[PDB]
């Protein structure tokens, strides 16, 4: 079909997304960048969609975290979901689509801004949220591996699918894990969608950045990087360790699995055959910047290998001496 300004798309219903793309790129993503706002909106897709259980209830990706912010925003697990929700609300009100659609749309666009990023399939027509999500549906970093895999399993995800989704921590920081150091990223290149997250979580920890005693934090191998307790355990648990390691220096797999599982996540509580494919609206991501590497000063011996069938790949270390990682601006 051909839309108002001559831009085209497969299905005419998708035309409404064009002016919304333009607005959010300029006014939410600070000029189509891969910074905080993108990170924040990516997180939001999860906090929305994961509110779904065949036993416990919840409408999955339905925008209920926005429509029922008052309730959900005040779940312990949704700490710091405030700003994101409050930031997207004017766009939701102003524009032409449901909150469920907007949350996933912005997330997908946001990802497409990150170097090494991938186009996430996007479908239109989620109806307004019916009710709030029930409590206890959002995984926390201090949840054990069994609790995390059970919850994600209950939502519809296998163990390997969890690992694939955690590629999101490649473009991610923390504000509330250690409040003393807001904006501390989970890997060295928070503005690039790459495998550094899967590499650097496998390294032997060295120190606590910021303060030493926080719920859901373990020692990080790098100053200016934070390691979630959960990610640390997932890189090493027999259920997830080998798949985790398989992501290392494997950009095409990372892109493929992330796009596939994100689309599955975005469809939680929904029906693909009852939506319109609006995937061609999603822009083309910039190519990957940089190659897989150990941090400077590090070597293979600093990797705590935990995949029983397959050894950790050979990676070189960055030229020079050990160094920190700036908080996310
Ligand atoms: C599976 C268990 C998971 C746990 C326990 C977990 C935990 C966390 C925690 C504690 C933070 C920091 C929040 C803060 O203190 O500010 C965070 C950030 C983030 N999470 Fe995860 N997460 C999980 C899975 C996921 C998934 C499936 C996605 C999918 C998109 C995701 C996307 C993000 C992003 C993009 C950020 C960065 C937010 C920012 O930098 O502003 N996470 N996560
Ligand atoms: Ca929801
Ligand atoms: Ca990265």
GROMACS .gro file of C-alpha atoms and ligand atoms in nm:
model
  374
    1UNK     CA    1   0.000   0.000   0.000
    2UNK     CA    2   0.096   0.367  -0.036
    3UNK     CA    3   0.068   0.593   0.269
    4UNK     CA    4   0.003   0.967   0.306
    5UNK     CA    5   0.358   1.087   0.234
    6UNK     CA    6   0.438   0.835  -0.040
    7UNK     CA    7   0.617   0.593   0.191
    8UNK     CA    8   0.495   0.241   0.122
    9UNK     CA    9   0.422  -0.072   0.324
   10UNK     CA   10   0.273  -0.418   0.261
   11UNK     CA   11  -0.049  -0.368   0.459
   12UNK     CA   12  -0.234  -0.035   0.451
   13UNK     CA   13  -0.329  -0.050   0.820
   14UNK     CA   14   0.044  -0.010   0.891
   15UNK     CA   15   0.050   0.341   0.738
   16UNK     CA   16  -0.040   0.497   1.074
   17UNK     CA   17   0.300   0.387   1.209
   18UNK     CA   18   0.498   0.616   0.977
   19UNK     CA   19   0.432   0.948   1.154
   20UNK     CA   20   0.469   0.764   1.486
   21UNK     CA   21   0.809   0.630   1.380
   22UNK     CA   22   0.919   0.984   1.292
   23UNK     CA   23   0.797   1.132   1.622
   24UNK     CA   24   0.946   0.870   1.856
   25UNK     CA   25   1.279   0.871   1.669
   26UNK     CA   26   1.320   1.246   1.718
   27UNK     CA   27   1.138   1.294   2.047
   28UNK     CA   28   1.183   0.972   2.246
   29UNK     CA   29   1.512   0.835   2.115
   30UNK     CA   30   1.701   1.165   2.113
   31UNK     CA   31   1.757   1.161   1.736
   32UNK     CA   32   1.732   0.786   1.668
   33UNK     CA   33   2.014   0.694   1.908
   34UNK     CA   34   2.096   0.374   2.096
   35UNK     CA   35   2.112   0.528   2.442
   36UNK     CA   36   1.915   0.532   2.769
   37UNK     CA   37   1.576   0.587   2.610
   38UNK     CA   38   1.618   0.283   2.385
   39UNK     CA   39   1.744   0.076   2.677
   40UNK     CA   40   1.449   0.192   2.886
   41UNK     CA   41   1.194   0.110   2.616
   42UNK     CA   42   1.347  -0.232   2.558
   43UNK     CA   43   1.318  -0.312   2.928
   44UNK     CA   44   0.955  -0.199   2.915
   45UNK     CA   45   0.861  -0.454   2.648
   46UNK     CA   46   0.964  -0.725   2.893
   47UNK     CA   47   0.792  -0.579   3.199
   48UNK     CA   48   0.478  -0.553   2.988
   49UNK     CA   49   0.481  -0.887   2.802
   50UNK     CA   50   0.598  -1.105   3.092
   51UNK     CA   51   0.282  -1.023   3.288
   52UNK     CA   52   0.123  -1.343   3.158
   53UNK     CA   53   0.046  -1.678   3.317
   54UNK     CA   54  -0.203  -1.949   3.214
   55UNK     CA   55  -0.236  -2.027   3.587
   56UNK     CA   56  -0.201  -1.687   3.752
   57UNK     CA   57  -0.350  -1.465   3.481
   58UNK     CA   58  -0.229  -1.149   3.311
   59UNK     CA   59  -0.277  -1.035   2.953
   60UNK     CA   60   0.082  -1.054   2.829
   61UNK     CA   61   0.195  -0.782   2.590
   62UNK     CA   62  -0.124  -0.571   2.617
   63UNK     CA   63   0.013  -0.238   2.741
   64UNK     CA   64  -0.131  -0.292   3.089
   65UNK     CA   65   0.184  -0.155   3.252
   66UNK     CA   66   0.095   0.181   3.096
   67UNK     CA   67  -0.286   0.166   3.115
   68UNK     CA   68  -0.263   0.040   3.474
   69UNK     CA   69   0.063   0.213   3.566
   70UNK     CA   70  -0.057   0.312   3.915
   71UNK     CA   71  -0.084  -0.056   4.006
   72UNK     CA   72   0.196  -0.231   3.813
   73UNK     CA   73   0.451   0.052   3.841
   74UNK     CA   74   0.425  -0.008   4.217
   75UNK     CA   75   0.524  -0.375   4.214
   76UNK     CA   76   0.864  -0.432   4.380
   77UNK     CA   77   0.990  -0.596   4.060
   78UNK     CA   78   0.883  -0.291   3.857
   79UNK     CA   79   1.115  -0.055   4.047
   80UNK     CA   80   1.228   0.226   3.819
   81UNK     CA   81   0.970   0.153   3.550
   82UNK     CA   82   0.830   0.497   3.644
   83UNK     CA   83   1.015   0.730   3.409
   84UNK     CA   84   0.981   0.504   3.105
   85UNK     CA   85   0.604   0.472   3.144
   86UNK     CA   86   0.564   0.843   3.220
   87UNK     CA   87   0.782   0.919   2.916
   88UNK     CA   88   0.578   0.708   2.671
   89UNK     CA   89   0.234   0.813   2.798
   90UNK     CA   90   0.214   1.139   2.600
   91UNK     CA   91   0.305   0.954   2.279
   92UNK     CA   92   0.039   0.692   2.353
   93UNK     CA   93  -0.228   0.955   2.415
   94UNK     CA   94  -0.117   1.168   2.120
   95UNK     CA   95  -0.091   0.887   1.865
   96UNK     CA   96  -0.306   0.640   1.679
   97UNK     CA   97  -0.244   0.294   1.830
   98UNK     CA   98  -0.294   0.093   2.150
   99UNK     CA   99  -0.049   0.100   2.441
  100UNK     CA  100   0.031  -0.266   2.376
  101UNK     CA  101   0.121  -0.187   2.016
  102UNK     CA  102   0.317   0.125   2.110
  103UNK     CA  103   0.531  -0.049   2.374
  104UNK     CA  104   0.642  -0.322   2.132
  105UNK     CA  105   0.673  -0.081   1.837
  106UNK     CA  106   0.902   0.158   2.024
  107UNK     CA  107   1.109  -0.133   2.155
  108UNK     CA  108   1.158  -0.270   1.806
  109UNK     CA  109   1.244   0.070   1.658
  110UNK     CA  110   1.475   0.136   1.951
  111UNK     CA  111   1.662  -0.188   1.888
  112UNK     CA  112   1.695  -0.100   1.517
  113UNK     CA  113   1.896   0.205   1.622
  114UNK     CA  114   2.170  -0.001   1.789
  115UNK     CA  115   2.482  -0.104   1.592
  116UNK     CA  116   2.474  -0.480   1.546
  117UNK     CA  117   2.101  -0.465   1.615
  118UNK     CA  118   1.834  -0.668   1.437
  119UNK     CA  119   1.489  -0.592   1.293
  120UNK     CA  120   1.226  -0.731   1.530
  121UNK     CA  121   0.905  -0.843   1.351
  122UNK     CA  122   0.613  -0.616   1.439
  123UNK     CA  123   0.240  -0.684   1.437
  124UNK     CA  124  -0.041  -0.433   1.479
  125UNK     CA  125  -0.382  -0.449   1.643
  126UNK     CA  126  -0.347  -0.534   2.012
  127UNK     CA  127  -0.666  -0.425   2.187
  128UNK     CA  128  -0.662  -0.206   2.499
  129UNK     CA  129  -0.559  -0.379   2.821
  130UNK     CA  130  -0.842  -0.545   3.015
  131UNK     CA  131  -0.696  -0.565   3.365
  132UNK     CA  132  -0.371  -0.515   3.557
  133UNK     CA  133  -0.103  -0.783   3.560
  134UNK     CA  134  -0.100  -1.001   3.871
  135UNK     CA  135   0.200  -0.973   4.103
  136UNK     CA  136   0.499  -1.215   4.099
  137UNK     CA  137   0.529  -1.244   3.719
  138UNK     CA  138   0.846  -1.036   3.672
  139UNK     CA  139   1.181  -1.212   3.736
  140UNK     CA  140   1.420  -1.046   3.979
  141UNK     CA  141   1.803  -1.066   3.978
  142UNK     CA  142   1.810  -1.236   4.318
  143UNK     CA  143   1.566  -1.506   4.212
  144UNK     CA  144   1.734  -1.846   4.194
  145UNK     CA  145   1.788  -2.010   3.852
  146UNK     CA  146   1.500  -2.252   3.914
  147UNK     CA  147   1.261  -1.968   4.000
  148UNK     CA  148   1.366  -1.773   3.691
  149UNK     CA  149   1.340  -2.070   3.454
  150UNK     CA  150   1.007  -2.174   3.606
  151UNK     CA  151   0.855  -1.829   3.566
  152UNK     CA  152   0.984  -1.788   3.209
  153UNK     CA  153   0.876  -2.147   3.141
  154UNK     CA  154   0.531  -2.072   3.278
  155UNK     CA  155   0.515  -1.778   3.037
  156UNK     CA  156   0.604  -2.006   2.746
  157UNK     CA  157   0.983  -1.991   2.727
  158UNK     CA  158   1.243  -2.269   2.721
  159UNK     CA  159   1.580  -2.233   2.896
  160UNK     CA  160   1.765  -2.157   2.571
  161UNK     CA  161   1.500  -1.898   2.481
  162UNK     CA  162   1.578  -1.722   2.810
  163UNK     CA  163   1.946  -1.702   2.718
  164UNK     CA  164   1.859  -1.558   2.376
  165UNK     CA  165   1.637  -1.290   2.531
  166UNK     CA  166   1.911  -1.191   2.774
  167UNK     CA  167   2.104  -1.066   2.473
  168UNK     CA  168   1.907  -0.755   2.571
  169UNK     CA  169   2.164  -0.706   2.850
  170UNK     CA  170   2.410  -0.634   2.572
  171UNK     CA  171   2.239  -0.295   2.560
  172UNK     CA  172   2.157  -0.234   2.923
  173UNK     CA  173   2.239  -0.058   3.251
  174UNK     CA  174   2.117  -0.068   3.612
  175UNK     CA  175   1.991   0.216   3.833
  176UNK     CA  176   1.838   0.036   4.131
  177UNK     CA  177   2.054  -0.275   4.179
  178UNK     CA  178   2.325  -0.049   4.320
  179UNK     CA  179   2.165   0.298   4.360
  180UNK     CA  180   2.506   0.447   4.443
  181UNK     CA  181   2.611   0.389   4.080
  182UNK     CA  182   2.315   0.458   3.847
  183UNK     CA  183   2.364   0.388   3.476
  184UNK     CA  184   2.624   0.117   3.525
  185UNK     CA  185   2.603  -0.119   3.224
  186UNK     CA  186   2.593  -0.499   3.217
  187UNK     CA  187   2.874  -0.506   2.962
  188UNK     CA  188   3.153  -0.289   2.822
  189UNK     CA  189   2.968  -0.173   2.511
  190UNK     CA  190   2.613  -0.077   2.623
  191UNK     CA  191   2.562   0.119   2.299
  192UNK     CA  192   2.632  -0.177   2.070
  193UNK     CA  193   2.421  -0.491   2.022
  194UNK     CA  194   2.695  -0.755   2.049
  195UNK     CA  195   2.830  -1.058   2.237
  196UNK     CA  196   3.037  -0.873   2.498
  197UNK     CA  197   2.764  -0.940   2.757
  198UNK     CA  198   2.796  -1.316   2.713
  199UNK     CA  199   3.175  -1.291   2.720
  200UNK     CA  200   3.215  -1.064   3.019
  201UNK     CA  201   2.967  -1.243   3.243
  202UNK     CA  202   3.177  -1.558   3.198
  203UNK     CA  203   3.487  -1.390   3.338
  204UNK     CA  204   3.591  -1.451   3.698
  205UNK     CA  205   3.455  -1.166   3.913
  206UNK     CA  206   3.702  -0.921   4.068
  207UNK     CA  207   3.521  -0.651   4.269
  208UNK     CA  208   3.195  -0.488   4.362
  209UNK     CA  209   3.164  -0.158   4.177
  210UNK     CA  210   2.994   0.106   4.392
  211UNK     CA  211   2.878  -0.036   4.726
  212UNK     CA  212   2.953  -0.393   4.830
  213UNK     CA  213   2.626  -0.530   4.973
  214UNK     CA  214   2.331  -0.519   4.733
  215UNK     CA  215   2.046  -0.760   4.663
  216UNK     CA  216   2.094  -0.928   4.325
  217UNK     CA  217   2.454  -0.816   4.275
  218UNK     CA  218   2.772  -1.023   4.262
  219UNK     CA  219   3.131  -0.919   4.191
  220UNK     CA  220   3.195  -0.782   3.842
  221UNK     CA  221   3.520  -0.842   3.654
  222UNK     CA  222   3.542  -0.476   3.553
  223UNK     CA  223   3.522  -0.141   3.731
  224UNK     CA  224   3.222   0.048   3.594
  225UNK     CA  225   3.037  -0.272   3.508
  226UNK     CA  226   2.770  -0.439   3.722
  227UNK     CA  227   2.697  -0.811   3.730
  228UNK     CA  228   2.352  -0.937   3.818
  229UNK     CA  229   2.343  -1.239   4.048
  230UNK     CA  230   2.102  -1.399   3.801
  231UNK     CA  231   2.318  -1.349   3.491
  232UNK     CA  232   2.618  -1.485   3.683
  233UNK     CA  233   2.427  -1.802   3.772
  234UNK     CA  234   2.275  -1.840   3.424
  235UNK     CA  235   2.617  -1.827   3.256
  236UNK     CA  236   2.721  -2.123   3.473
  237UNK     CA  237   2.410  -2.340   3.520
  238UNK     CA  238   2.419  -2.665   3.315
  239UNK     CA  239   2.077  -2.580   3.168
  240UNK     CA  240   2.197  -2.250   3.022
  241UNK     CA  241   2.579  -2.244   3.029
  242UNK     CA  242   2.647  -2.405   2.690
  243UNK     CA  243   2.387  -2.197   2.508
  244UNK     CA  244   2.518  -1.887   2.685
  245UNK     CA  245   2.869  -1.966   2.566
  246UNK     CA  246   2.738  -2.040   2.215
  247UNK     CA  247   2.638  -1.673   2.185
  248UNK     CA  248   3.002  -1.564   2.226
  249UNK     CA  249   3.146  -1.423   1.902
  250UNK     CA  250   2.829  -1.532   1.724
  251UNK     CA  251   2.657  -1.219   1.594
  252UNK     CA  252   2.428  -1.391   1.341
  253UNK     CA  253   2.288  -1.627   1.605
  254UNK     CA  254   2.245  -1.343   1.852
  255UNK     CA  255   2.053  -1.139   1.595
  256UNK     CA  256   1.844  -1.432   1.472
  257UNK     CA  257   1.740  -1.570   1.812
  258UNK     CA  258   1.678  -1.227   1.963
  259UNK     CA  259   1.447  -1.125   1.679
  260UNK     CA  260   1.266  -1.458   1.691
  261UNK     CA  261   1.213  -1.472   2.066
  262UNK     CA  262   1.135  -1.098   2.100
  263UNK     CA  263   0.853  -1.145   1.849
  264UNK     CA  264   0.728  -1.442   2.047
  265UNK     CA  265   0.746  -1.232   2.365
  266UNK     CA  266   0.565  -0.939   2.201
  267UNK     CA  267   0.284  -1.179   2.110
  268UNK     CA  268   0.225  -1.310   2.463
  269UNK     CA  269  -0.148  -1.302   2.530
  270UNK     CA  270  -0.211  -1.222   2.164
  271UNK     CA  271  -0.296  -1.398   1.838
  272UNK     CA  272  -0.073  -1.344   1.531
  273UNK     CA  273  -0.353  -1.446   1.294
  274UNK     CA  274  -0.558  -1.165   1.447
  275UNK     CA  275  -0.299  -0.892   1.392
  276UNK     CA  276  -0.151  -0.722   1.086
  277UNK     CA  277   0.214  -0.774   0.986
  278UNK     CA  278   0.371  -0.430   1.006
  279UNK     CA  279   0.730  -0.555   1.008
  280UNK     CA  280   0.853  -0.356   0.708
  281UNK     CA  281   0.816  -0.029   0.905
  282UNK     CA  282   1.112  -0.122   1.125
  283UNK     CA  283   1.428   0.059   0.999
  284UNK     CA  284   1.757  -0.110   0.908
  285UNK     CA  285   2.002  -0.134   1.203
  286UNK     CA  286   2.360  -0.003   1.167
  287UNK     CA  287   2.621  -0.277   1.112
  288UNK     CA  288   2.810  -0.422   1.409
  289UNK     CA  289   3.090  -0.202   1.546
  290UNK     CA  290   3.395  -0.390   1.674
  291UNK     CA  291   3.479  -0.758   1.723
  292UNK     CA  292   3.451  -1.008   2.008
  293UNK     CA  293   3.730  -0.967   2.262
  294UNK     CA  294   3.844  -1.019   2.618
  295UNK     CA  295   3.884  -0.695   2.816
  296UNK     CA  296   4.234  -0.544   2.820
  297UNK     CA  297   4.479  -0.727   3.047
  298UNK     CA  298   4.259  -1.037   3.053
  299UNK     CA  299   4.336  -1.382   2.911
  300UNK     CA  300   4.162  -1.717   2.861
  301UNK     CA  301   4.251  -1.824   3.216
  302UNK     CA  302   4.022  -1.547   3.346
  303UNK     CA  303   3.721  -1.724   3.193
  304UNK     CA  304   3.531  -1.962   3.419
  305UNK     CA  305   3.432  -2.216   3.155
  306UNK     CA  306   3.107  -2.392   3.239
  307UNK     CA  307   3.004  -2.565   2.918
  308UNK     CA  308   3.081  -2.933   2.967
  309UNK     CA  309   3.068  -3.038   2.598
  310UNK     CA  310   3.237  -2.739   2.435
  311UNK     CA  311   3.546  -2.531   2.531
  312UNK     CA  312   3.536  -2.150   2.539
  313UNK     CA  313   3.632  -1.995   2.202
  314UNK     CA  314   3.970  -1.831   2.145
  315UNK     CA  315   3.944  -1.454   2.184
  316UNK     CA  316   4.216  -1.191   2.192
  317UNK     CA  317   4.223  -0.914   2.452
  318UNK     CA  318   4.201  -0.541   2.381
  319UNK     CA  319   4.539  -0.366   2.337
  320UNK     CA  320   4.680  -0.230   2.663
  321UNK     CA  321   4.599  -0.214   3.039
  322UNK     CA  322   4.288  -0.273   3.252
  323UNK     CA  323   4.028   0.005   3.238
  324UNK     CA  324   3.685   0.105   3.368
  325UNK     CA  325   3.349   0.154   3.196
  326UNK     CA  326   3.162   0.487   3.210
  327UNK     CA  327   2.809   0.484   3.351
  328UNK     CA  328   2.537   0.517   3.086
  329UNK     CA  329   2.486   0.891   3.013
  330LIG     C1  330   1.514  -1.323   3.285
  330LIG     C2  331   1.540  -1.257   3.398
  330LIG     C3  332   1.582  -1.108   3.400
  330LIG     C4  333   1.621  -1.045   3.511
  330LIG     C5  334   1.633  -1.107   3.652
  330LIG     C6  335   1.652  -0.908   3.476
  330LIG     C7  336   1.696  -0.810   3.561
  330LIG     C8  337   1.727  -0.681   3.526
  330LIG     C9  338   1.767  -0.579   3.619
  330LIG    C10  339   1.781  -0.599   3.771
  330LIG    C11  340   1.788  -0.467   3.551
  330LIG    C12  341   1.833  -0.332   3.611
  330LIG    C13  342   1.711  -0.250   3.650
  330LIG    C14  343   1.761  -0.137   3.735
  330LIG     O1  344   1.805  -0.163   3.850
  330LIG     O2  345   1.758  -0.021   3.686
  330LIG    C15  346   1.763  -0.493   3.410
  330LIG    C16  347   1.774  -0.402   3.308
  330LIG    C17  348   1.736  -0.423   3.177
  330LIG     N1  349   1.667  -0.534   3.129
  330LIG    FE1  350   1.672  -0.726   3.222
  330LIG     N2  351   1.629  -0.892   3.341
  330LIG    C18  352   1.585  -1.013   3.290
  330LIG    C19  353   1.552  -1.035   3.158
  330LIG    C20  354   1.536  -0.940   3.059
  330LIG    C21  355   1.468  -0.959   2.932
  330LIG    C22  356   1.400  -1.089   2.886
  330LIG    C23  357   1.475  -0.844   2.863
  330LIG    C24  358   1.413  -0.823   2.722
  330LIG    C25  359   1.413  -0.706   2.657
  330LIG    C26  360   1.548  -0.747   2.945
  330LIG    C27  361   1.579  -0.616   2.914
  330LIG    C28  362   1.645  -0.524   2.992
  330LIG    C29  363   1.703  -0.400   2.944
  330LIG    C30  364   1.703  -0.347   2.799
  330LIG    C31  365   1.763  -0.332   3.067
  330LIG    C32  366   1.837  -0.196   3.073
  330LIG    C33  367   1.748  -0.082   3.117
  330LIG    C34  368   1.826   0.047   3.111
  330LIG     O3  369   1.949   0.042   3.085
  330LIG     O4  370   1.766   0.155   3.132
  330LIG     N3  371   1.583  -0.810   3.063
  330LIG     N4  372   1.725  -0.625   3.399
  331LIG    CA1  373   0.112  -0.656   3.050
  332LIG    CA1  374   2.712  -0.459   2.418
   0.00000   0.00000   0.00000
